[PDB]
Each structure stands twice: as C-alpha cells, then as structure tokens.
Amino acid sequence: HKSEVAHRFKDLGEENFKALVLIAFAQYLQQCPFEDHVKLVNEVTEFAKTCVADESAENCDKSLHTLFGDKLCTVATLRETYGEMADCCAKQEPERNECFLQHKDDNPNLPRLVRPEVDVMCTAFHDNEETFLKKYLYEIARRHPYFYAPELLFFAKRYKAAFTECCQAADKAACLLPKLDELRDEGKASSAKQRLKCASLQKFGERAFKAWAVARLSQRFPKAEFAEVSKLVTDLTKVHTECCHGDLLECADDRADLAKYICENQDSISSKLKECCEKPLLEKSHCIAEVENDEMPADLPSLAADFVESKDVCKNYAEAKDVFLGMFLYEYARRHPDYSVVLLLRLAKTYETTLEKCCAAADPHECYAKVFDEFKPLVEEPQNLIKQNCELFEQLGEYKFQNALLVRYTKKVPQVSTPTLVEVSRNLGKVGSKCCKHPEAKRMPCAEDYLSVVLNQLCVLHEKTPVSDRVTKCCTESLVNRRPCFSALEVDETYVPKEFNAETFTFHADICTLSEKERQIKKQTALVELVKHKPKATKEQLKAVMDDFAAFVEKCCKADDKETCFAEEGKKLVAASQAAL
Ligand SMILES: O=C(O)[C@](F)(OC(F)(F)C(F)(F)C(F)(F)F)C(F)(F)F
Ligand SMILES: O=C(O)[C@](F)(OC(F)(F)C(F)(F)C(F)(F)F)C(F)(F)F
Ligand SMILES: CCCCCCCCCCCCCC(=O)O
Ligand SMILES: CCCCCCCCCCCCCC(=O)O
Ligand SMILES: CCCCCCCCCCCCCC(=O)O
Ligand SMILES: CCCCCCCCCCCCCC(=O)O
Ligand SMILES: [Br-]
C-alpha cells in the first residue's frame, strides 16, 4: 500500500485510531499535559484523513515510524523537558527510531492516581465522557509506557461499560466499585505478566521459552500435529522477541501476521477459533490468546510405546534430542490440559535426565524401563496441595483462609516486613478464592497463571530489599523449582521472638468506623505482629487470643462508652493474652 497511515485508519477506524495515537504519544511524552496530547492526536488524525482522500497527497507515502519521529521532534520543549531524547532528532532513520526506543522512561516520577468519589466520577462521565475516558487513558499510559497499546484500549472499553451501567443504578457504588477493583487487579496482573515474559526470554533463554510454548499450545490445540505446533512455536518466539524489543508497530504487525496464518489454517489447528477469526484485525490476536482449549482426539494411545518400549528410543533421541523431547512434551500436554506447564516441564526434564543417563549405559532399555514411575510423585505433590488448600478455604472463607496463610508464612519467614506479609497473604487467599471455584481440571492451570505473577513480584521486591537467603535461593532457582522451593520452606528455628510493644497491640474505637478492608488489614497486621512476638504459639493458643480479641471489638464497638472500653478492656485482653502465651 502507498500510504501506511491511510491503511491503518481504514483498518482500525477513526475512533480506535485516535485512542491508539493518544496512547502511543502518552507513553513517550509522559510529562506533557493532556491538552497538548489532544492537539497532537487531532493533527495526526486530520493528516490521516488527507491521505485517506488522496494516498498520493504530500507526506502520505512516509513511514508511520518516520511520521511519529517527526512529530516528537516538533515538540518545542523536548530538550528542556526530556534532555537526551531530543538528541535522537539529530540522527537519521532507522537510527532515530532505535534512539527513541532506548530513551523511554520506565519510572515516570508521577503522583499515584487517586480514585475519586463515585458521584464525582459519574458526574464527570455524564457531562464529558470522551474527555473523562481519554484523560484516564492518558494518565494510565504515561504511568505504564510498555503496556501493549491495543490491550490498554480494550481495558478502556471495559471501564466505559462499567460507568455506563453503574452510574444509572440505584446503589451506584455497590455496582461500580467492585468492577473498578476487578479491572485494576486484572490490569496490574497483565502489566506484570508482560514484563515477566520479556525478562524470562533474556534470563532463561529461547530454548526455555519454546518448551513452555510447545506445552501450552499442545494443551490448547491438541488435535494439531507436532509439526504445526512446532511451526506456531517458532513464529510465536519471533513475535515475543520483536515485541520485547519495544517497537509497537513491529510487534502489532508480527502478531497480526500470526493471527492471519492461524485463522487461514483452523482445520489444521483448532475448532474453537471461528469467532476470534471473524473479529476485526485489532482484536483477533487477543481473542486467539484467550481461546478455550479444543477437545483432544477421543482415543489416544499410551506414551510408553514410543517413549519407553520402542528399541529405537536412544536412536531417535540422538538424531535430534530437542525434537524428541518436544514430541514427548507435545504428547504429554495434549493429554493433560489439567496440568500446569511447569509440571509438564518437570516431567520432560526427568525423561531427558533419564535418557542422558541410560542411553550411554551398559543396558539402556532396562535402565529407563520404569521412567513413568518417576513422574507420579511429581504429579501428586501439586495435586494434593490444591485439594488440601481448596478444602481448608471452603471451611474458612477468604479472610480466615488469608489469616491461616498469614500464620503459616510469618512462621516460615518472620524477617519479612509486616506490610509485605499482609499483602502477599491476602493476594494468595484471592488466588485460592478464584481458582478453587474452577473445577479440579482447571485449578492447577488457574493457580499457575496467578502464582507466576504473585511470586515474581515477591522475588522482585526481595532483590531490592533482601531479608532471607532462603527466599533468595527459591527466587534464584530454576523457574520449574520456584514454587516447590517456597512450599518446602519450614518454620524458622533460628528467629528470635520480636520484643513486645504495647502500641502494636493498642486499639481505638476508630476501628469501628473503618471500612471492612481497612479493618481487616489492621487486624491482620496485628496477627502478623502477634506471631512475630510469640512464634512458638500453638494454633489452639492463637485461636484463643483471636477469639478473645474478636469478642473485645464487637463489645467495645457496641458500648455506650467506647473510647474507654477499648482502653480499659484492652489493657486486660493484652495482659491475659501475654500470659496464655
Ligand atoms: O505446578 C506448580 O508448581 C504450580 F506453580 O503451583 C501449584 F501446583 F498450583 C501449587 F502447587 F502452588 C498449588 F498449591 F497451587 F497446587 C502451578 F501453579 F504451576 F501448578
Ligand atoms: O504453594 C504454596 O505453599 C504457596 F503457599 O501457595 C499455595 F499454598 F499454593 C497457596 F496457598 F497460595 C494456594 F492458594 F495457591 F494454594 C506458595 F506461597 F508457596 F506459593
Ligand atoms: C485503562 C483505561 C482507563 C480509562 C478509564 C478509567 C476510568 C476509571 C478511573 C478511576 C480508576 C482509578 C484507578 C483505580 O481503580 O484505582
Ligand atoms: C520447538 C520444538 C523443540 C524446541 C523446544 C524443546 C526443548 C525440550 C525442553 C527440555 C528441557 C526442559 C527444561 C527447560 O528448558 O526449562
Ligand atoms: C503514529 C501513531 C501510530 C499508532 C498506531 C498504532 C497501531 C497499533 C494497532 C495494531 C493492531 C493490533 C494487531 C494485533 O495486536 O493483533
Ligand atoms: C501480646 C499481646 C497480643 C494482644 C492480643 C491481640 C492480638 C489479636 C490480633 C489478631 C486478631 C485476629 C483478627 C480476627 O480473628 O478476626
Ligand atoms: Br520486605
């Protein structure tokens, strides 16, 4: 096509084009005001319309990379505001585009966004909806400059739907606030997930990424042949490498080309792609990544024929070790969508270690005859953990389950800050809430999706502020051994009980006026501090103190005089608690 800008406008549509141009500029000019960005979008949009009317109009034949760079270099305050970045304007393309990619700021030093009152939000949405939504699209994009632009737009459309339905309801807040809390949690997870994959591609390697992909794609597309899975995996690895380099237009085109191939080869891939493949180009790649797993071929044979019995195991392996191990992973994963990818990789590393030892031993066939038995323990450990934890959750409920986790983790690593302990424990209790609702066959995959991001954030915080070598060890082990390591941590036998401090256990009536959330965190912060002072306390002993405290609040929160109840009846609860322990 002669005009890329015209081709994108016609393909995306005016509304979507204007929103993506706003996000693109906001992620590079993170310190320019919203009104400045609106003017840029309108200037690029009117030029695009000139090219849609006549593709041979001036500058309509230029690259979108050249047009983006030219506009960035027209900003008059560029040097004074961004310094080094302005020096990219002295370079020619393609060196200027690479220079801009290298000078984007990951940490904008900006104040946190404060959720306004519902009525203020709903009044703003009504009087000027586009302004309200684009202002917040700008605020988020400047704060998250590496978040894939098309996905941020998909979240904005979700936010629009929440405000449209809730701002005209009877209890707006009861409708909207639970939705904004869900969208925020989903957005933070996607950001962390996007950055984690790129950091993994560099730390663990391309071979490692490809094993992960073979396993996941064989679970989603079980009827596809190994060679189609191997093709999609080779292509998916190229898209991830480009996307992780940072260029949005290059990432979007690679992703779209792969979507086009998948949709032109559905009969050779999956029966669940019909609707994703009818959707517009902007949403096709996203839809495919969320597609449900296809049913597997009804009768599939045992894996022992080709992987244990056949006399040609060591021969087929030596011919191409990674192809053979990939075929094993493909065959095991297609049959086990109920497993985590990391479990399937543990089973693959066990077969590889076994073949490496037995294929060079006096008698190989006998040496590896019982390999499938080495897989049973690896499968039951994660399976039992899921059942045990999902059972304890059902008997307790989210908050109490979170509190059961709090005591467990505080005793395992008591050096961790009380705030870090409370958040991690609350987050993990949420994974259990959501995943334990899914059925047994989707629980382990659910847990992996969320634990991957919960644990890496924990390991990121620990790198910055290290406190335990045992956490460092688990955080610096093979990613296949990360969760098993954390789960194997035992109660710290070396920790010295923290010294008592009355204030930490001093409570006021301000608690009765707090939200459920703020009140839960206050109590949980105190439970952490209790276990830190009395780490040898038994579950019978702690339940007693917790039962006594609970009875204290309800009472002093119901007493004609409260400020005194909390003070007097609180000096007794503490002294009796100290004695029981
Ligand atoms: O396979 C793993 O090791 C895994 F990471 O954890 C786990 F199995 F889900 C688990 F063990 F944490 C539990 F408790 F949730 F089962 C997951 F999530 F990848 F499966
Ligand atoms: O695996 C564990 O021991 C772990 F505690 O997670 C967990 F137990 F699986 C869980 F409780 F978070 C749940 F809900 F997923 F089951 C942790 F911290 F190691 F990941
Ligand atoms: C990501 C695109 C968002 C555009 C619309 C956002 C509207 C919600 C504003 C209030 C949310 C503030 C952040 C929060 O939920 O804590
Ligand atoms: C695309 C087909 C072959 C490419 C990838 C197959 C590699 C086999 C993985 C065996 C090692 C698993 C452990 C790991 O890398 O994390
Ligand atoms: C000059 C500003 C250019 C901004 C245009 C950005 C276009 C990105 C949208 C590409 C469509 C998404 C493709 C995909 O992810 O499958
Ligand atoms: C060493 C003296 C400790 C003071 C006693 C108060 C400790 C209770 C804090 C945790 C309460 C648990 C909350 C709950 O069960 O709902
Ligand atoms: Br910490």
Residue numbers in the entry: 3 to 583
Structure paper excerpt:
A key aspect to be clarified, to address the adverse health effects associated with the exposure to PFASs, is their binding mode to human serum albumin (hSA), the most abundant protein in plasma. Indeed, the average half-life values for serum elimination of legacy PFASs, such as PFOA and PFOS, in environmentally exposed human populations are estimated to be in the order of 1–5 years, depending on the type of compound. Such long persistence and accumulation of long-chain PFASs in circulation have been ascribed to their ability to bind human serum albumin (hSA), the most abundant protein in plasma with a maximum circulatory half-life of 19 days in humans. hSA can bind a large diversity of PFASs, shielding their hydrophobic character and strongly enhancing their absorption and distribution throughout the body ultimately leading to relatively high blood concentration. In this study, we investigated the interaction between hSA and two representative branched short-chain PFASs, namely, HPFO-DA and C6O4. In-solution studies revealed that both compounds bind hSA with affinities and stoichiometries lower than that of the legacy long-chain perfluoroalkyl compound PFOA.
To better resemble the physiological conditions, cocrystallization trials were performed in the presence of a representative fatty acid, the myristic acid (Myr). A total of six distinct binding sites, two occupied by HPFO-DA and four by Myr, have been identified. The electronic density of bound HPFO-DA ligands was clearly visible allowing a definite assignment of the positions and orientations of both hydrophilic carboxylate head groups and fluorinated lipophilic tails. Both HPFO-DA molecules (herein named HPFO-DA1 and HPFO-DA2) occupy the long and narrow Sudlow’s drug-binding site II that span between FA3 and F4 sites, both located in subdomain IIIA. HPFO-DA1 is lying into the FA3 site while HPFO-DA2 lodges the F4 site. The carboxylate head-group of HPFO-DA1 forms hydrogen bonds with the side chain of Ser342, Arg348, and Arg485 residues. The rest of the fluorinated tail accommodates in the hydrophobic tunnel and establishes nonpolar contacts with surrounding Ser342, Val344, Arg348, Pro384, Leu387, Ile388, Met446, Ala449, Glu450, Leu453, and Arg485 residues. The hydrophilic carboxylate head-group of HPFO-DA2 is instead engaged in a hydrogen bond with the side chain of Ser489, while numerous polar interactions are established between fluorine atoms (F6, F12, F14, F15, F16, F18, and F19) and the oxygen and nitrogen atoms of both main and side chains of nearby Asn391, Tyr411, Leu430, Phe488, and Ser489 residues. Indeed, while the hSA-HPFO-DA-Myr complex revealed the presence of two HPFO-DA molecules bound to FA3 (HPFO-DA1) and F4 (HPFO-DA2) sites, respectively, the hSA-PFOA-Myr complex identified a single PFOA molecule located in the FA4 site and a Myr one into the FA3 pocket.
